[PDB]
Amino acid sequence: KDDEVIDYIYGKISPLFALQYIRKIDLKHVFEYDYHFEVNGTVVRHKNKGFGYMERFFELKESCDERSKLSKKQYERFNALFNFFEKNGVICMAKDAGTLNTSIEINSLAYHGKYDVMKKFIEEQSVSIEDDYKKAFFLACLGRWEESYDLYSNIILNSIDESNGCVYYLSQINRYRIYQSITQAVTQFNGLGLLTFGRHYKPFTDEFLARIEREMTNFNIDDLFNGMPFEFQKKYKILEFLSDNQFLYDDTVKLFELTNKVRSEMSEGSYSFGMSSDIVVLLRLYDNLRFLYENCLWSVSFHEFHQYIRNSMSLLIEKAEYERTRDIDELGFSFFGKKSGFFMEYYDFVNISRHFKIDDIKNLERSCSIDKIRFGEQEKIEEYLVGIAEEITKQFSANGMNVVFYTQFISEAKAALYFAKYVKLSEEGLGKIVKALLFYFPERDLDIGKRYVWLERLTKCNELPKSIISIIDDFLVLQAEKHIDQNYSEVSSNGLYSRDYGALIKHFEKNFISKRLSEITLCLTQDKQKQIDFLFKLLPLLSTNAKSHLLSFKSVENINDLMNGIRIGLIDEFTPEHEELIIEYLETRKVNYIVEKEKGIQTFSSNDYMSTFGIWYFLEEINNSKMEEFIGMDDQYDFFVDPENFDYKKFIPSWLKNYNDKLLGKIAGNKHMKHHVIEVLKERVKNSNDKRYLEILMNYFI
Amino acid sequence: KDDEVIDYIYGKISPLFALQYIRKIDLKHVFEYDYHFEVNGTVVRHKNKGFGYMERFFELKESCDERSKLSKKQYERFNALFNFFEKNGVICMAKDAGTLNTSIEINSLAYHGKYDVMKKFIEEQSVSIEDDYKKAFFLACLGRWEESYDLYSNIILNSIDESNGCVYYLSQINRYRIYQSITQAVTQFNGLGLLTFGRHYKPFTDEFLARIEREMTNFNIDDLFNGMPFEFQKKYKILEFLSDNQFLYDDTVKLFELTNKVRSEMSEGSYSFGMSSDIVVLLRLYDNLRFLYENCLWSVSFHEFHQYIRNSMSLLIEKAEYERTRDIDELGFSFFGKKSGFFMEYYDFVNISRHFKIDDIKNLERSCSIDKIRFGEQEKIEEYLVGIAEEITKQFSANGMNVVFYTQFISEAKAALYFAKYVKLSEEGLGKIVKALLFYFPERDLDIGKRYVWLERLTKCNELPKSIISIIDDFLVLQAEKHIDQNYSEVSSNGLYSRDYGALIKHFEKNFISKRLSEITLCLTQDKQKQIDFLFKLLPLLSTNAKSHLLSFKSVENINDLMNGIRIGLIDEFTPEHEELIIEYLETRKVNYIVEKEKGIQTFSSNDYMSTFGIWYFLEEINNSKMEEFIGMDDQYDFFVDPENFDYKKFIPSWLKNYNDKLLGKIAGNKHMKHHVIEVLKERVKNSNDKRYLEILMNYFI
Amino acid sequence: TVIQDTADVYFKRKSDGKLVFTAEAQTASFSQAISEEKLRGGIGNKPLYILKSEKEINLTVKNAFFDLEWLAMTSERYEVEYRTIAYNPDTEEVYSDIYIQFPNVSPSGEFEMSLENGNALAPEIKFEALADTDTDEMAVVIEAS
Amino acid sequence: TVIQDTADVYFKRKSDGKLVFTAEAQTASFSQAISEEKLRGGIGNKPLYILKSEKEINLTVKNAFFDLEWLAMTSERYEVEYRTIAYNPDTEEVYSDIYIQFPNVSPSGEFEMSLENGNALAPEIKFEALADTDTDEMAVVIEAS
């Protein structure tokens, strides 16, 4: 009767309420492969000997009278089972399946970007061992790995006292993982942190390390499950898969085979009915994420999970791009037309930020066009970003900062500020974001060039109001003040300096005269020549009297000064003295080259200036004939000054893609270079379809 | 102490002599991780606190004086160790090693598909259990699964008391694998066998199936290793890798991580040094193949291994294809001598052929350009292919071909004949291969269209001698004789018939007449109308008198008959009767379409003829204004008849592939449509990455 | 929100019309390429033009279930009835349904006796649409609306 | 058969003549992209032309071994001494070697805080060749015959 099925299902599910969430894929282990639980909730029959194992329960759900026939006890039990099966997401038996709904799963603030709320919880007094478990996860997430280890030992003892098997098991695994993280952190500190800083940090005291090593050793989780009581094994066969040290034993293999299948689908051009491959990819991904986070498992930090999530999200984005560029056949349109696009909700932003690295985001942006897809939940993303910026500003404005948290948080902050290019932001949010970017962002990680390019990226989508201009002006004046010391210089990994900040300000505001810079210039004298050069770099920003003062103090004297002057607009033409200076520089380079001919010739910084002089010669700017004498010095120099004699076998793909607009038009003007350049261009695009090459080929040359 | 070093290493390596070959990696398990044995051959000094006995061993290998002071028994032990390490592939330490070489040396009969020698060794008398072991592997590879199962049972019976741990263990594994093979095979014969073969093929008798079912029930493979004696497990840890049913996960995930690294290297445009990730995958792939085949394990037949090797070989091919086209940058090429290019060898051919599918070989062909890769060792591959053809002809020459061996061998024969396009063969080999394919390849597994396209593939690298013309003429005459019956209909999956074989013959040899068909025609009669229709297709392939007889017996007044006459050159211009007939067909289709409007629209086939009619109208062939009245079915018809009226939004780019050079030029010459086709193509080659679109664009640069 | 095309495929003997099996649609690949002869081995003249493009329709189903009568009783030809609900973008669930059918098809499964050691029940059956001289391919579509 | 010019990357302190570590070089990525004011926003006038191209050099090594003295003693600047043997197609093995250097480099690796299970033995250190206003790129090539 109905009571039989109700009692059976409740008996199987009774000890499964302790977990805050379970993957549905593993539910088969509960019923001994009797039913196959798809990701979409449908329960497909696989094997059964009796009747009413599950179908009777579903019928009870449909028929309220069948639920009424039950006693009060069975009524409450069915209500609880209904609540649980709703919470898990399991739907009606597969035999009777309608239109199933697919949306991102629910999660905790631990997964979201909430640090202040997290610290308030830690401050309060714990209620139950579950609260201690959550607090320990929060601590370990906040960098206090020593405190988290201590609390994990505490809850191990408490759960031993209270006989909570699931808590004991999960605590054992998480504590082992925190020990691993601490030991690897100590080793990597002593290995590289000395090189990065100069005085190795010791956040973990040596005696503490000895204590942890003595407390546990020769312990491998691969056997842990075999020690638990047989009752826990029989009931909780879902958690058995957590014991192995080679985590993600199966999930990576399923990912590999699903990925090969998806790539085959893209290559073939084959449509899909029912739940496609990408849909099951997404459902598996979110089940894994929810089980790990909402159940508070510490193994989300380790690189394995990061690689797994990177692969899943990159596959999903690649598939979405294909579905955006896939040509549709008329019969294909008959099968399906106007398929839904890819919405990048706030959950996707959080995952991409947390689990990628900056080179990997670069890879994604290189392969696909992320800017073509539309984002959603703009407000939630903006809140997450403003929380990030507020956290960094609060932690860095004061002296207080934890190095462990630095390692564990700066990658996320960097990736989030990088990935905020497409999301629109509020004016207060943008102000806080840039104020944290330009002022309190560390120089150990982000140097000046990367800082500038990230600022440009933020500028792209939501423009700069006057407040951001004021912030940039404050940053520039701070740089000028820092420039007092003689020892100070400028260093840039990507080759970008403060002149570009000034150019950005100027381009945004057609007229913007900074009074503070002019005051500082008026405060300058002969002895502060370094500050005079710095102020020369940012000259248009300051006022007219400061311009006259600086021009009086110094003028053009060498190639670097001439370069900067022509860059920031003071000099609009090359005077005879200037071109004479270039001729002497070329003579010096020629003598150095003939000296070095015995050695191995190299041209890294000189090639820039020589190529620039060649470009000017091409553009009919410089009329001096002596430059022709230096022919044969550098391949690009000969290419531009005398293309005709130059042999067209030194062309480099770097120039053939990183071309230049007006110069591109001029090359297109000249037939002699045009023949060979279009030949090589079409050859290269044919061999490999690179977007920039196609753009050059289609836009200018034809 | 040299003697202590030799004694220790001999004590460690002596049990390994029984195994035919051992993987390089697994050697680390022998020394308890003391040294990390790289795949290349070197042995890096992983963390250990011993003498450095490997260092002294390699010193001994270097200096003759050191090994000449060894005691005699120690001298024999040392040279035995030298032989073993030469066999496996170990060389020396990493620091000492300057440059190493790689080669593939699999030498089993199973790997070279030696079926005749296999059965001869089976029938020849045995003298030891090792001989029985090889015999059983040969039988199972030969399809006689029942005999292989019984022989494995006998081997276990003898080995349990003969104290051969390795043989007993591997025989348990092999018996379980063969049981799985037979069980899944009978399950495929019972249900799906009826649909597939059209019969209830039951090679296994019911009592035998029951015998195996009750013979080895409740046998958990995962326990096998733990059942073996302690000494075996202590001394043969290398073989724990085989016990688990889900083995070769480790290689799958490690291939997943080395597929991510190589893909990142492609994406960035890097320049790797030393041992590239591609070399590691290649070494691991041929170290797994060699281990499994040489040691004679049946697991090499399942699907997991096929997937693993498919992914490995595919990845290697794409990496080589990419490197074939790389940015110059004048940097990488200078470092190492010339280029370590990818070239195809016989071992690669065997691996691809055995472990791929025809749909999977087409993917690798569509992504990369296999034909650019260079193939070597032509004679060995010719031997392989001639062996395959001889086996198929011998088996199909009689009516006896094991059904379970016909399922195991047909996929390999198909893949080999498919992939033998690129390799070069001798004239005798070409005749043998063509005759076997055409005459003895079963019709249920390779229907007419696939047969024609494979024959066409073979004749691309090698031109056709006269022997091939004779063979194909014999097969064609056989079909013509078969078509006397008035119930014989042709089935062509890809849309190619015997007429296309006639086309291939009359193409590769312009002048050729088959007198056998002429004399068949001379006996032709009105009753055999189907024969008249079939043999009417090959008109130029007959004699003049045969042509006169065929023309006298029937005319060409029908749509299909008109199409055939157009294709074979029978009719060159549309007579008034012809245009009237096509107009009649168009009117019939118009009334059918009008009826369908109220009863739903079906349009796949008649639009084919309508599209051909539209193309004829465009090219100034059909001169009747009636076709303009028939406009209404929008499937290329109006687009070719009235370009202006047709909504160019409805245009599908994919229609451009099916056109030819003349048609492409004519359409480009049309001003009324050129702009929209070029814009669609340019946005289609800018969003998608299909080269054929770029070729159509080269035609459409105008 | 999941892709709402849970098509029902009915595999029936084309010879008599006796239902053979019933399955759930999984995928449908279409390919059109000129593989006739070499890359361009077609036959043509100055005044003659013939469309030599050949096309293959490949289908794959899942969870096929066999009729008891057919299993009991056991040039043969078979037909597939594809039954799908029409979902226009304006109306994601239209009462009108789309009937696809391939009256002619061959059970040329690429399964070819896969002996994987995984406990998964997916007897995915491949299909290729066979043709004839008169009929280029046998696929047919109809609109209920 | 494989690359036979193993690279020796000597990492030395720039301030004084001491060696920091030695490693086996693994890869060297080069990049040249215009990101100054996105792809557009650079300085431009009718008679003026300025190359605003900015390029970066990224290096990665493996099996780094740090000097004992450097560990004992511990604006800092460091130099790299890439040491490969120049090999031409005509001369796959040449006595002449190629000497690449990075006198202005920043020791910064992303491996920092990778907490993989089963502690890894691949401390792949990344390196970025810092530039200066006067020197567009500091890397230098010299062949010893």
XYZ file of C-alpha atoms in Angstrom, chain A residues 50-513:
464
model
C 8.964 -5.101 -7.029
C 6.478 -2.283 -7.534
C 5.928 1.151 -6.061
C 9.567 1.818 -5.203
C 9.282 5.457 -6.308
C 6.470 5.740 -8.871
C 3.914 5.272 -6.094
C 5.408 8.222 -4.205
C 5.135 10.416 -7.299
C 1.515 9.344 -7.747
C 0.854 10.254 -4.109
C 2.299 13.673 -4.901
C -0.084 14.043 -7.840
C -3.155 12.637 -6.049
C -3.895 14.493 -2.752
C -6.545 11.813 -1.876
C -3.801 9.079 -1.884
C -1.843 11.279 0.616
C -5.131 11.611 2.629
C -5.473 7.758 2.848
C -2.193 7.808 4.837
C -2.064 7.998 8.610
C -0.895 11.154 10.363
C 2.638 9.794 10.817
C 2.916 8.866 7.148
C 1.361 12.225 6.264
C 4.096 14.155 8.079
C 6.753 11.863 6.618
C 5.464 12.445 3.090
C 5.411 16.194 3.715
C 9.048 16.099 4.838
C 10.037 13.984 1.835
C 8.249 16.415 -0.476
C 10.130 19.332 1.083
C 13.474 17.547 0.736
C 12.896 16.515 -2.876
C 11.893 20.094 -3.658
C 15.049 21.441 -2.004
C 17.353 18.973 -3.858
C 15.677 19.801 -7.231
C 14.555 16.201 -8.064
C 11.372 16.386 -10.281
C 8.498 13.908 -11.083
C 9.436 10.374 -12.344
C 11.078 10.513 -15.846
C 8.215 8.355 -17.298
C 5.999 11.476 -16.706
C 8.275 14.499 -17.533
C 7.066 17.905 -18.919
C 9.137 21.087 -19.582
C 11.930 21.016 -16.926
C 13.399 24.446 -15.871
C 17.213 25.121 -15.731
C 18.658 28.112 -13.745
C 21.908 28.708 -11.723
C 21.654 27.010 -8.253
C 21.433 28.884 -4.859
C 24.571 29.566 -2.702
C 25.983 31.108 0.576
C 27.770 34.466 1.263
C 30.917 32.284 1.776
C 30.810 31.692 -2.044
C 29.650 35.325 -2.687
C 31.822 38.439 -1.982
C 30.991 39.250 1.711
C 33.943 39.756 4.164
C 32.516 42.259 6.737
C 29.332 40.142 7.340
C 31.700 37.112 7.609
C 33.775 38.810 10.404
C 30.615 39.761 12.387
C 29.568 36.104 12.475
C 33.009 35.075 13.729
C 32.819 37.661 16.513
C 29.507 36.348 17.856
C 29.138 33.419 20.238
C 28.715 30.046 18.541
C 25.423 28.193 18.967
C 25.920 24.608 17.776
C 28.650 22.441 16.285
C 27.280 23.335 12.855
C 27.942 26.991 13.678
C 31.488 26.093 14.734
C 31.964 24.251 11.436
C 30.778 27.269 9.448
C 32.941 29.603 11.542
C 36.023 27.457 10.929
C 35.392 27.494 7.190
C 34.983 31.279 7.371
C 38.244 31.669 9.296
C 40.146 29.489 6.840
C 38.648 31.639 4.081
C 39.805 34.826 5.868
C 43.464 33.777 6.058
C 43.750 32.827 9.747
C 44.732 29.286 8.826
C 46.233 28.658 12.269
C 42.960 29.634 13.958
C 40.957 27.519 11.513
C 43.184 24.526 12.268
C 42.685 25.028 16.001
C 38.915 25.267 15.599
C 38.840 22.175 13.375
C 40.607 20.177 16.070
C 38.115 21.589 18.576
C 35.109 20.479 16.533
C 36.734 17.082 15.954
C 36.722 16.605 19.718
C 33.196 18.016 20.037
C 31.791 15.775 17.290
C 33.490 12.762 18.863
C 31.639 13.705 22.045
C 28.307 14.193 20.235
C 28.648 11.247 17.801
C 27.865 13.213 14.619
C 29.388 11.037 11.918
C 29.043 13.431 8.992
C 30.605 16.347 10.881
C 33.474 14.145 12.080
C 34.190 12.944 8.534
C 34.028 16.355 6.871
C 36.108 17.911 9.648
C 38.808 15.257 9.248
C 39.107 15.849 5.507
C 39.063 19.649 5.816
C 41.638 19.677 8.626
C 43.984 17.506 6.593
C 43.567 19.923 3.695
C 44.324 22.968 5.866
C 47.476 21.258 7.139
C 48.525 20.643 3.544
C 47.912 24.285 2.658
C 49.931 25.549 5.630
C 52.924 23.304 4.933
C 52.989 24.104 1.222
C 52.702 27.795 2.098
C 55.692 27.673 4.440
C 57.775 25.925 1.796
C 56.778 28.337 -0.976
C 57.439 31.329 1.286
C 60.976 30.193 2.083
C 61.408 29.405 -1.612
C 60.285 32.590 -3.357
C 59.020 35.200 -0.895
C 62.607 36.068 -0.043
C 63.172 36.843 -3.724
C 59.959 38.854 -4.075
C 60.419 41.013 -0.954
C 63.934 40.477 0.401
C 63.175 39.419 3.980
C 61.172 36.206 4.069
C 57.855 36.489 5.884
C 57.151 34.081 8.743
C 53.408 34.319 9.435
C 53.548 30.731 10.713
C 55.844 30.276 13.698
C 58.291 27.375 13.617
C 57.093 25.834 16.888
C 53.533 25.831 15.544
C 54.751 23.968 12.456
C 56.501 21.393 14.633
C 53.314 21.001 16.671
C 51.178 20.344 13.593
C 53.750 17.928 12.161
C 53.908 15.931 15.397
C 50.134 15.969 15.912
C 49.429 14.302 12.554
C 51.830 12.411 10.298
C 51.717 9.254 8.194
C 48.001 10.025 7.797
C 46.483 9.655 4.326
C 42.778 10.274 3.814
C 42.672 7.444 1.261
C 41.942 5.048 4.157
C 39.879 7.351 6.398
C 36.474 6.084 5.275
C 37.398 2.474 6.000
C 37.783 3.431 9.664
C 34.352 4.981 10.128
C 31.596 2.863 11.712
C 29.862 0.452 9.355
C 26.546 2.223 9.950
C 27.971 5.478 8.598
C 29.279 3.603 5.558
C 25.944 1.933 4.819
C 23.977 5.160 5.243
C 26.432 7.729 3.852
C 27.795 6.065 0.733
C 27.650 9.459 -1.001
C 30.536 10.908 1.032
C 32.722 7.829 0.448
C 34.117 9.480 -2.679
C 35.633 12.311 -0.605
C 38.153 10.036 1.114
C 40.675 9.684 -1.709
C 43.602 12.085 -1.845
C 43.380 12.040 -5.659
C 40.200 14.084 -5.543
C 38.005 14.474 -8.625
C 38.849 10.922 -9.662
C 35.757 10.584 -11.866
C 34.569 14.131 -12.577
C 37.621 15.057 -14.643
C 37.181 11.966 -16.834
C 33.508 12.702 -17.471
C 34.528 16.260 -18.289
C 37.152 15.029 -20.747
C 34.766 12.734 -22.603
C 31.918 15.282 -22.597
C 34.358 17.867 -23.958
C 35.496 15.607 -26.789
C 31.834 14.950 -27.577
C 31.051 18.682 -27.605
C 34.015 19.455 -29.868
C 32.876 16.700 -32.223
C 29.429 18.308 -32.282
C 30.924 21.689 -33.177
C 33.132 20.208 -35.895
C 30.422 18.075 -37.498
C 27.702 20.717 -37.470
C 25.105 18.483 -35.810
C 21.989 19.726 -34.048
C 20.859 18.423 -30.677
C 17.472 17.532 -29.206
C 16.538 17.191 -25.582
C 19.194 18.181 -23.091
C 22.313 18.814 -25.159
C 25.917 18.318 -24.054
C 26.417 21.883 -22.814
C 23.271 21.698 -20.670
C 24.518 18.633 -18.810
C 27.925 20.324 -18.554
C 26.338 23.315 -16.818
C 24.154 21.207 -14.532
C 27.101 19.064 -13.426
C 29.169 22.203 -12.844
C 26.588 23.884 -10.640
C 25.858 20.700 -8.701
C 29.572 20.405 -7.915
C 29.882 24.069 -6.940
C 26.794 23.987 -4.732
C 27.755 20.744 -2.985
C 31.245 22.084 -2.265
C 30.281 25.590 -1.135
C 26.838 25.295 0.470
C 28.169 22.296 2.402
C 31.347 24.286 3.219
C 34.188 22.084 1.970
C 37.697 23.561 2.183
C 38.847 21.832 -1.019
C 37.616 24.762 -3.154
C 40.924 26.604 -2.692
C 43.141 23.878 -4.140
C 44.266 24.203 -7.743
C 42.413 21.057 -8.855
C 38.978 22.626 -8.439
C 40.212 25.825 -10.070
C 41.344 23.877 -13.139
C 38.038 21.986 -13.247
C 35.967 25.168 -13.105
C 38.230 26.874 -15.639
C 37.685 24.045 -18.106
C 33.923 23.923 -17.558
C 33.386 27.671 -17.970
C 35.739 27.960 -20.947
C 33.931 25.091 -22.668
C 30.562 26.714 -22.004
C 31.712 30.083 -23.359
C 33.247 28.464 -26.448
C 30.028 26.567 -27.135
C 27.983 29.752 -26.685
C 30.258 31.564 -29.130
C 29.789 28.774 -31.656
C 25.966 28.866 -31.222
C 26.311 32.663 -31.933
C 28.349 32.019 -35.182
C 26.758 28.657 -36.286
C 25.065 28.941 -39.754
C 21.499 27.505 -39.628
C 20.116 25.258 -42.359
C 16.449 25.450 -43.346
C 15.792 21.954 -41.998
C 17.860 22.922 -38.969
C 15.637 25.957 -38.516
C 12.646 23.622 -38.750
C 14.137 21.558 -35.919
C 14.901 24.717 -33.927
C 14.926 28.436 -34.607
C 15.882 31.457 -32.517
C 17.593 29.389 -29.835
C 18.153 31.290 -26.602
C 21.463 33.091 -26.227
C 23.991 32.933 -23.411
C 23.233 35.148 -20.406
C 26.201 35.813 -18.118
C 24.443 36.251 -14.793
C 26.141 37.371 -11.590
C 26.985 33.788 -10.612
C 29.014 33.368 -13.800
C 30.952 36.555 -13.066
C 31.745 35.365 -9.551
C 32.939 31.985 -10.830
C 35.078 33.389 -13.652
C 36.664 35.893 -11.270
C 37.350 33.481 -8.419
C 38.590 30.458 -10.360
C 40.581 31.895 -13.293
C 44.022 33.458 -13.553
C 44.765 36.547 -15.587
C 46.562 34.710 -18.385
C 43.519 32.421 -18.624
C 41.061 35.319 -18.853
C 43.373 36.645 -21.561
C 43.164 33.290 -23.354
C 39.361 33.344 -23.220
C 39.166 36.922 -24.485
C 41.580 35.987 -27.282
C 39.609 32.970 -28.498
C 36.062 34.322 -28.082
C 34.311 37.701 -28.232
C 32.990 38.055 -24.691
C 31.900 41.631 -25.420
C 29.141 40.453 -27.787
C 27.162 38.593 -25.108
C 24.843 40.579 -22.842
C 25.266 40.555 -19.064
C 22.573 40.390 -16.403
C 22.089 41.236 -12.741
C 24.193 44.363 -13.181
C 23.339 45.565 -9.674
C 24.585 42.411 -7.937
C 27.849 42.419 -9.905
C 28.366 46.087 -9.066
C 27.783 45.362 -5.381
C 30.356 42.551 -5.503
C 32.903 44.831 -7.182
C 32.358 47.692 -4.740
C 32.777 45.218 -1.897
C 36.088 44.130 -3.429
C 37.351 47.699 -3.750
C 36.204 48.641 -0.260
C 37.952 45.580 1.165
C 41.265 46.399 -0.500
C 41.076 50.077 0.470
C 40.203 49.294 4.088
C 42.978 46.726 4.423
C 45.717 48.735 2.665
C 45.053 52.292 3.871
C 46.053 51.164 7.363
C 49.208 49.208 8.129
C 47.242 46.042 8.903
C 47.491 43.276 6.316
C 47.980 39.511 6.404
C 50.350 38.016 3.849
C 48.509 34.678 3.724
C 45.332 36.595 2.935
C 47.326 38.622 0.417
C 48.219 35.472 -1.514
C 44.703 34.067 -1.152
C 42.840 37.277 -2.101
C 44.924 39.436 -4.458
C 44.441 37.079 -7.406
C 40.665 37.289 -6.984
C 40.750 41.078 -6.619
C 42.956 41.455 -9.697
C 40.778 39.181 -11.821
C 37.585 40.916 -10.675
C 38.899 44.407 -11.426
C 40.049 43.062 -14.796
C 36.721 41.384 -15.600
C 34.682 44.450 -14.602
C 35.245 45.868 -18.106
C 31.857 44.789 -19.471
C 29.689 45.411 -16.391
C 28.266 48.910 -16.030
C 28.902 50.624 -12.703
C 27.305 53.378 -10.650
C 29.080 56.700 -10.215
C 29.737 56.094 -6.520
C 30.851 52.564 -7.343
C 33.135 53.781 -10.120
C 34.612 56.407 -7.815
C 35.376 53.891 -5.081
C 36.719 51.421 -7.652
C 39.209 53.836 -9.212
C 40.185 55.337 -5.855
C 41.158 51.858 -4.693
C 42.802 51.074 -8.044
C 45.130 54.059 -8.367
C 46.033 54.786 -4.728
C 46.005 51.735 -2.449
C 46.654 48.916 -4.929
C 50.011 47.307 -4.067
C 53.094 47.811 -6.205
C 54.427 44.309 -5.502
C 51.686 42.791 -7.680
C 50.366 45.562 -9.942
C 53.063 47.897 -11.248
C 52.342 51.133 -13.093
C 51.807 49.841 -16.632
C 49.295 47.163 -15.692
C 47.555 49.757 -13.521
C 47.173 52.113 -16.474
C 45.841 49.481 -18.839
C 43.285 48.335 -16.247
C 42.186 51.953 -15.812
C 41.706 52.205 -19.579
C 39.631 49.023 -19.550
C 37.375 50.412 -16.831
C 37.030 53.637 -18.821
C 35.854 51.736 -21.909
C 32.276 50.886 -20.912
C 31.272 53.571 -18.389
C 33.015 56.861 -19.095
C 34.693 59.102 -16.516
C 32.812 61.968 -14.827
C 34.648 64.937 -13.353
C 35.198 63.178 -10.016
C 37.359 60.495 -11.635
C 39.308 63.232 -13.418
C 39.949 64.778 -10.007
C 41.140 61.408 -8.682
C 43.561 61.019 -11.601
C 44.820 64.564 -11.010
C 45.444 63.711 -7.357
C 47.371 60.602 -8.415
C 49.513 62.616 -10.841
C 50.317 65.271 -8.241
C 51.217 62.515 -5.772
C 53.644 61.133 -8.356
C 55.144 64.598 -8.826
C 55.652 64.936 -5.070
C 57.208 61.461 -4.888
C 59.588 62.591 -7.655
C 61.578 64.819 -5.196
C 64.254 62.221 -4.466
C 67.125 61.767 -6.899
C 66.994 57.979 -6.537
C 63.448 57.817 -7.919
C 62.899 56.590 -11.473
C 60.144 55.040 -13.605
C 59.699 51.299 -14.156
C 56.993 49.580 -16.193
C 56.612 45.912 -17.086
C 54.355 46.774 -20.032
C 56.134 50.026 -20.917
C 53.472 52.545 -19.836
C 54.155 55.657 -17.754
C 52.438 58.727 -16.282
C 52.429 60.579 -19.605
C 49.651 58.198 -20.647
C 47.586 59.105 -17.581
C 47.979 62.718 -18.648
C 46.956 61.862 -22.203
C 43.845 60.086 -20.910
C 42.842 63.090 -18.798
C 43.402 65.428 -21.729
C 41.462 63.318 -24.222
C 38.481 63.079 -21.877
C 38.388 66.812 -21.046
C 39.302 68.997 -24.016
C 40.403 71.665 -21.509
C 41.712 70.716 -18.063
C 44.309 72.927 -16.358
